Amino acid sequence: ALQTIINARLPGEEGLWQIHLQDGKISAIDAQSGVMPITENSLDAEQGLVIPPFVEPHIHLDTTQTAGQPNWNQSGTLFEGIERWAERKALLTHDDVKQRAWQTLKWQIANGIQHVRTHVDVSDATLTALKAMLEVKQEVAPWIDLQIVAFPQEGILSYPNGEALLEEALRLGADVVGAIPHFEFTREYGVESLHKTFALAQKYDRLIDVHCDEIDDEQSRFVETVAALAHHEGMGARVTASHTTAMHSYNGAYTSRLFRLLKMSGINFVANPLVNIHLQGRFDTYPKRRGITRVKEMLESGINVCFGHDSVFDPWYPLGTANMLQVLHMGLHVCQLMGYGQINDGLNLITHHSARTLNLQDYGIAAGNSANLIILPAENGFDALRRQVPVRYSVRGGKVIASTQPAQTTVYLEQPEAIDYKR
Amino acid sequence: ALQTIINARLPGEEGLWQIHLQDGKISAIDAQSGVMPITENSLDAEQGLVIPPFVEPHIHLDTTQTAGQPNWNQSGTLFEGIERWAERKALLTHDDVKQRAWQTLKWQIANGIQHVRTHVDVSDATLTALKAMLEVKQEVAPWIDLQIVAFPQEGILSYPNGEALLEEALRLGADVVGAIPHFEFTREYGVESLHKTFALAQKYDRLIDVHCDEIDDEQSRFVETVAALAHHEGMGARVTASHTTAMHSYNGAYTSRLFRLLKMSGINFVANPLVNIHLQGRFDTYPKRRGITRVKEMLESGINVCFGHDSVFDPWYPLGTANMLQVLHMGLHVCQLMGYGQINDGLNLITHHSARTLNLQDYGIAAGNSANLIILPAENGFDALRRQVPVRYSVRGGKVIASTQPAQTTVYLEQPEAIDYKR
Ligand SMILES: O=C1NC=C(F)[C@H](O)N1
Ligand SMILES: O=C1NC=C(F)[C@H](O)N1
Ligand SMILES: [Fe+3]
Ligand SMILES: [Fe+3]
């Protein structure tokens, strides 16, 4: 078994490092003063970057791989997406869900993702997808720690037996309680649905992840209730507000007032760049707003924010290979986090910040932690992002679970020349 | 020498095709009714997509690889970018320019780009970069047909001897006349600068490519003068309006009136997605506009529009590997061209439409044309875009000038499994 990772670069650190492994855990981390020789039982990072695993804080594995079935989302909006999904949800089968979820999970394993939070639509009396996903969770455990959010896609108060079905999903084992206040029939149902969500999370000791204000409506302010209830219950670390795209349209004075509460509450935020740039701004003609939440300001204020892929070939997104560096690339551009340091520090948005969002207790390159880490063939975060590098090796429990032999490009000039796009 | 390309898929066509090569040209194209066997002198496309070469209609090779030298563009705006570039322009040397231009050109060759239009700043009495680029043009000719735009970065009427320097650049051999009306001191200088640009293009029989209305100013309407002068002179095919980002902010009534003229004029449009999403919207707080020109509407109206990378690690853009599929990916998202057919047809924005913009006379997979083509390991445009595939082979004059051995990804589950991200 592997005993050491050598010649590793670490974000924010100078030089090279050696990571000693023992019994599936990291036993010690020591700085090197030069390049170490390879040897049996040593995985050579070759001066590449070593980081804890990529994380997918927000994806829909029950809907993945279904775009165009039975119809396509023509308008490219959240609302038509839900209608198209409703048509597909009526055709679900146990095996159908497991096969599609596993297809995307394999792409995630290949992409160095070892932690995934999937929402599963529980606005369905049969709970077909949830039952299938609970089995997938057990099956994929050796490679990915999968969290399941009981997501009441059609509302808690606005769907028949919505609250009972949400609770049934928790009794069956869902890890996180979801909600979607802006989709409820009225603002009052939206606020009430959040009180019910928090009560269920406290009753069952579960996390919370709300699809919150995913709409270009400057009056959609459910995020303040999510943060206030979390603060009141002293449970911010266990709470996440996904999307908050309406915040892109708020006036600045209200946003400033709100930010004090967001920071005090300690709740987490997920932005989904690939899907948000596609679904938001659809009701504008020109100019057209970007529609991503206030990521730059959250980072400046010390509010935990991270990025999710959200959808992979489904009603809300026709593309994707479940690649977090690609999600990061889109977010940095749309949010204008284009300074050198902002880009270089971008990896935090798909690693550490996402681990905090999932309330992970065993994450990071530190002594005592499980030996879960990935190696990128790049010098730092900036380089990895610019070149959209693959994951050279993914290690879990001290064993290699995925590897990518890099592509080899040659140009035939006066003589052949290898091209690696580096400077 | 290669005699045939077999098992090729072609955009918009059903089945497989064989492309016969003779004397460096395409002699004939014949449909296949099944998979053909490989043999010596036959390049097997392996049911991948064969298209004419990618094109880069807008890049700055004189500024490439200079980001942060001597200072960084902190605000991420066009205006500070020009100031930072001015500082770097004062430090230019002949060899400096040739080395950096060649570095990016090699990445382009590796990425299947055989046609490139580079702007070169001629607001410089020494014309240092232009002299260097004219040599690079000759040196890179076996691999890339490079067009040089004499670009008066600091204005024609607003810079000392600007008009004389612009004409001197044409007398030295620049292929295209540039302008930047929105950067001139006054609207009147902007309009007058365009009359001077057109007069020079007719005097020397050169093409025109104007950095046009690259500003979030709803009153920046220099595009109507570019189109009207082209229509008057009957030279639309030879004229290009780059950027036109102000069009993102125009009211709809004026835009509708304008579109009639744009179509009648026959001029070309270049949008630069990676740079536009970064530099535009910088004066908005929230909501923030996207700032790309009206690409979707141009396509619906039959107006020729295409995509450029614009900058590769320079004052206006800190990233890039000169990859056109990556430029296309950003443009489809920001412009909301996310329908299946829109994404699949996206390749036109980086191939045929760009060739028209460069007024190319020998481009396309057709009998009689030079055997210049590339092979993508994908089933169609949608697949190539979704998976961001590399260029498997680039063929020029019937010879392979670049090749990429694809990466190999494996996940170690109960048994090893190859992952190609396909469905
Ligand atoms: O409500 C939603 N359902 C599915 C999505 F992909 C989007 O995150 N929002
Ligand atoms: O005026 C400009 N100079 C350089 C750029 F990259 C941008 O295209 N605009
Ligand atoms: Fe979602
Ligand atoms: Fe430019």
Side-chain angles (χ1 to χ4, degrees):
Chain A
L2 290 178
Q3 293 176 52
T4 322
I5 306 298
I6 64 175
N7 302 143
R9 289 184 183 293
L10 300 170
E13 299 297 328
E14 300 300 306
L16 300 176
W17 304 75
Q18 192 171 185
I19 303 168
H20 303 287
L21 312 179
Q22 180 66 59
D23 297 342
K25 294 178 174 54
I26 296 171
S27 54
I29 299 162
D30 299 299
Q32 301 176 190
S33 58
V35 176
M36 285 284 174
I38 182 57
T39 187
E40 189 173 0
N41 302 312
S42 276
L43 188 58
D44 194 358
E46 303 185 317
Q47 303 187 62
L49 199 69
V50 175
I51 52 172
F54 284 135
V55 178
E56 169 52 272
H58 188 131
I59 193 164
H60 295 259
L61 294 178
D62 60 333
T63 68
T64 193
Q65 310 297 343
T66 68
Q69 312 174 344
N71 301 299
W72 287 89
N73 177 171
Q74 302 311 314
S75 65
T77 63
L78 166 68
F79 312 107
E80 178 175 349
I82 292 170
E83 180 52 41
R84 293 290 81 77
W85 167 240
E87 294 169 346
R88 186 60 170 74
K89 175 164 57 173
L91 309 169
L92 295 175
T93 75
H94 189 80
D95 289 352
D96 162 56
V97 174
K98 297 184 68 181
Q99 299 179 314
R100 291 182 290 96
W102 256 113
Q103 174 172 33
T104 293
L105 284 160
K106 288 181 185 183
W107 293 3
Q108 292 179 306
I109 297 172
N111 294 337
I113 298 167
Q114 295 183 207
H115 296 282
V116 176
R117 171 177 284 177
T118 183
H119 293 260
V120 176
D121 184 355
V122 297
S123 291
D124 175 356
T126 71
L127 295 174
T128 296
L130 176 67
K131 290 180 296 186
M133 207 63 65
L134 284 162
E135 290 182 4
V136 172
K137 174 177 175 178
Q138 298 171 70
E139 296 170 359
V140 78
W143 305 280
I144 287 177
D145 188 345
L146 182 66
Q147 291 185 186
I148 293 166
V149 187
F151 173 48
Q153 176 75 92
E154 306 193 30
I156 295 173
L157 297 175
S158 307
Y159 186 81
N161 300 314
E163 191 177 1
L165 286 169
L166 179 59
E167 184 161 8
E168 182 178 359
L170 299 178
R171 290 188 290 95
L172 289 165
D175 306 290
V176 190
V177 195
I180 187 174
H182 55 283
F183 194 71
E184 301 281 358
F185 293 162
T186 68
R187 188 186 192 281
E188 290 66 40
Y189 280 5
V191 172
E192 184 180 1
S193 78
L194 294 175
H195 284 275
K196 291 176 177 293
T197 295
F198 275 78
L200 283 168
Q202 293 295 64
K203 178 175 178 180
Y204 291 91
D205 191 9
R206 301 294 158 82
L207 307 178
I208 292 173
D209 191 320
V210 179
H211 269 68
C212 198
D213 307 307
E214 188 188 2
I215 184 173
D216 294 321
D217 177 12
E218 79 287 346
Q219 294 169 52
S220 194
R221 295 177 173 187
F222 296 109
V223 63
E224 70 180 19
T225 293
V226 176
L229 287 175
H231 187 268
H232 177 73
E233 299 278 346
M235 63 186 286
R238 292 163 58 210
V239 180
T240 296
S242 279
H243 291 298
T244 65
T245 56
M247 201 188 296
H248 193 267
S249 300
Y250 294 168
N251 62 71
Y254 170 71
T255 302
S256 185
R257 194 285 282 163
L258 177 67
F259 261 51
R260 174 175 179 265
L261 163 64
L262 303 189
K263 182 56 182 172
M264 289 173 72
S265 76
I267 72 170
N268 304 287
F269 293 83
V270 177
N272 295 297
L274 299 174
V275 170
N276 296 333
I277 194 65
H278 159 54
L279 306 184
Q280 303 308 120
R282 290 281 182 169
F283 299 90
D284 285 333
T285 49
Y286 280 103
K288 208 178 307 282
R289 74 199 69 214
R290 294 166 188 233
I292 293 185
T293 192
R294 303 189 184 216
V295 180
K296 178 179 288 184
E297 294 65 34
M298 285 171 182
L299 290 171
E300 289 169 354
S301 295
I303 290 166
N304 191 56
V305 59
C306 65
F307 292 163
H309 200 298
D310 202 1
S311 299
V312 173
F313 199 72
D314 79 5
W316 303 276
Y317 193 67
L319 295 170
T321 53
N323 187 301
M324 304 317 292
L325 281 174
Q326 188 178 87
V327 174
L328 176 60
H329 175 278
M330 182 62 65
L332 296 171
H333 283 77
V334 177
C335 299
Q336 293 176 331
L337 283 161
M338 297 287 286
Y340 181 85
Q342 295 175 322
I343 294 166
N344 191 59
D345 291 346
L347 291 187
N348 291 327
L349 296 163
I350 55 176
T351 54
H352 294 284
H353 292 191
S354 298
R356 181 172 177 185
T357 293
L358 267 56
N359 203 41
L360 302 185
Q361 305 298 307
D362 183 359
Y363 184 93
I365 309 304
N369 285 2
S370 294
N372 301 344
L373 55 87
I374 64 176
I375 300 179
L376 306 182
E379 304 184 5
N380 47 48
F382 175 88
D383 187 41
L385 186 286
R386 184 177 69 81
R387 294 189 295 109
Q388 292 286 288
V389 303
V391 171
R392 184 71 182 82
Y393 294 104
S394 176
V395 174
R396 185 172 171 75
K399 292 182 170 54
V400 172
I401 57 166
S403 67
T404 289
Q405 171 179 293
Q408 286 173 43
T409 302
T410 305
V411 293
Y412 302 93
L413 309 183
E414 294 199 305
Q415 291 177 51
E417 288 180 37
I419 298 299
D420 59 8
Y421 306 97
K422 299 180 185 180
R423 191 180 84 283
Chain B
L2 290 178
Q3 293 176 52
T4 322
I5 306 298
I6 64 175
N7 302 143
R9 289 184 183 293
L10 300 170
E13 299 297 328
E14 300 300 306
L16 300 176
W17 304 75
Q18 192 171 185
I19 303 168
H20 303 287
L21 312 179
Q22 180 66 59
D23 297 342
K25 294 178 174 54
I26 296 171
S27 54
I29 299 162
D30 299 299
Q32 301 176 190
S33 58
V35 176
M36 285 284 174
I38 182 57
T39 187
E40 189 173 0
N41 302 312
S42 276
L43 188 58
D44 194 358
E46 303 185 317
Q47 303 187 62
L49 199 69
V50 175
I51 52 172
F54 284 135
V55 178
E56 169 52 272
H58 188 131
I59 193 164
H60 295 259
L61 294 178
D62 60 333
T63 68
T64 193
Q65 310 297 343
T66 68
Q69 312 173 344
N71 301 299
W72 287 89
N73 177 171
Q74 302 311 314
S75 65
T77 63
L78 166 68
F79 312 107
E80 178 175 349
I82 292 170
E83 180 52 41
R84 293 290 81 77
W85 167 240
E87 294 169 346
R88 186 60 170 74
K89 175 164 57 173
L91 309 169
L92 295 175
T93 75
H94 189 80
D95 289 352
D96 162 56
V97 174
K98 297 184 68 181
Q99 299 179 314
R100 291 182 290 96
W102 256 113
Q103 174 172 33
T104 293
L105 284 160
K106 288 181 185 183
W107 293 3
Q108 292 179 306
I109 297 172
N111 294 337
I113 298 167
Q114 295 183 207
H115 296 282
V116 176
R117 171 177 284 177
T118 183
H119 293 260
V120 176
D121 184 355
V122 297
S123 291
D124 175 356
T126 71
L127 295 174
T128 296
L130 176 66
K131 290 180 296 186
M133 207 63 65
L134 284 162
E135 290 182 4
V136 172
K137 174 177 175 178
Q138 298 171 70
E139 296 170 359
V140 78
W143 305 280
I144 287 177
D145 188 345
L146 182 66
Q147 291 185 186
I148 293 166
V149 187
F151 173 48
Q153 176 75 92
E154 306 193 30
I156 295 173
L157 297 175
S158 307
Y159 186 81
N161 300 314
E163 191 177 1
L165 286 169
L166 179 59
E167 184 161 8
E168 182 178 359
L170 299 178
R171 290 188 290 95
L172 289 165
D175 306 290
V176 190
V177 195
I180 187 174
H182 55 283
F183 194 71
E184 301 281 358
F185 293 162
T186 68
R187 188 186 192 281
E188 290 66 40
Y189 280 5
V191 172
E192 184 180 1
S193 78
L194 294 175
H195 284 275
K196 291 176 177 293
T197 295
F198 275 78
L200 283 168
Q202 293 295 64
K203 178 175 178 180
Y204 291 91
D205 191 9
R206 301 294 158 82
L207 307 177
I208 292 173
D209 191 320
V210 179
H211 269 68
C212 198
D213 307 307
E214 188 188 2
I215 184 173
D216 294 321
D217 177 12
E218 79 287 346
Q219 294 169 52
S220 194
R221 295 177 173 187
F222 296 109
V223 63
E224 69 180 19
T225 293
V226 176
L229 287 175
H231 187 268
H232 177 73
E233 299 278 346
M235 63 186 286
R238 292 163 58 210
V239 180
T240 296
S242 279
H243 291 298
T244 65
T245 56
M247 201 188 296
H248 193 267
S249 300
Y250 294 168
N251 62 71
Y254 170 71
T255 302
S256 185
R257 194 285 282 163
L258 177 67
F259 261 51
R260 174 175 179 265
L261 163 64
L262 303 189
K263 182 56 182 172
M264 289 173 72
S265 76
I267 72 170
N268 304 287
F269 293 83
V270 177
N272 295 297
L274 299 174
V275 170
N276 296 333
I277 194 65
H278 159 54
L279 306 184
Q280 303 308 120
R282 290 281 182 169
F283 299 90
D284 285 333
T285 49
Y286 280 103
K288 208 178 307 282
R289 74 199 69 214
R290 294 166 188 233
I292 293 185
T293 192
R294 303 189 184 216
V295 180
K296 178 179 288 184
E297 294 65 34
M298 285 171 182
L299 290 171
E300 289 169 354
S301 295
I303 290 166
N304 191 57
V305 59
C306 65
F307 292 163
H309 200 298
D310 202 1
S311 299
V312 173
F313 199 72
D314 79 5
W316 303 276
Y317 193 67
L319 295 170
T321 53
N323 187 301
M324 304 317 292
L325 281 174
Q326 188 178 87
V327 174
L328 176 60
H329 175 278
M330 182 62 65
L332 296 171
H333 283 77
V334 177
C335 299
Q336 293 176 331
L337 283 161
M338 297 287 286
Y340 181 85
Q342 295 175 322
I343 294 166
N344 191 59
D345 291 346
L347 291 187
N348 291 327
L349 296 163
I350 55 176
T351 54
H352 294 284
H353 292 191
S354 298
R356 181 172 177 185
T357 293
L358 267 56
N359 203 41
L360 302 185
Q361 305 298 307
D362 183 359
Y363 184 93
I365 309 304
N369 285 2
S370 294
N372 301 344
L373 55 87
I374 64 176
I375 300 179
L376 306 182
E379 304 184 5
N380 47 48
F382 175 88
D383 187 41
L385 186 286
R386 184 177 69 81
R387 294 189 295 109
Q388 292 286 288
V389 303
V391 171
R392 184 71 182 82
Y393 294 104
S394 176
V395 174
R396 185 172 171 75
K399 292 182 170 54
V400 172
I401 57 166
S403 67
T404 289
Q405 171 179 293
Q408 286 173 43
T409 302
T410 305
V411 293
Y412 302 93
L413 309 183
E414 294 199 305
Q415 291 177 51
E417 288 180 37
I419 298 299
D420 59 8
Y421 306 97
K422 299 180 185 180
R423 191 180 84 283

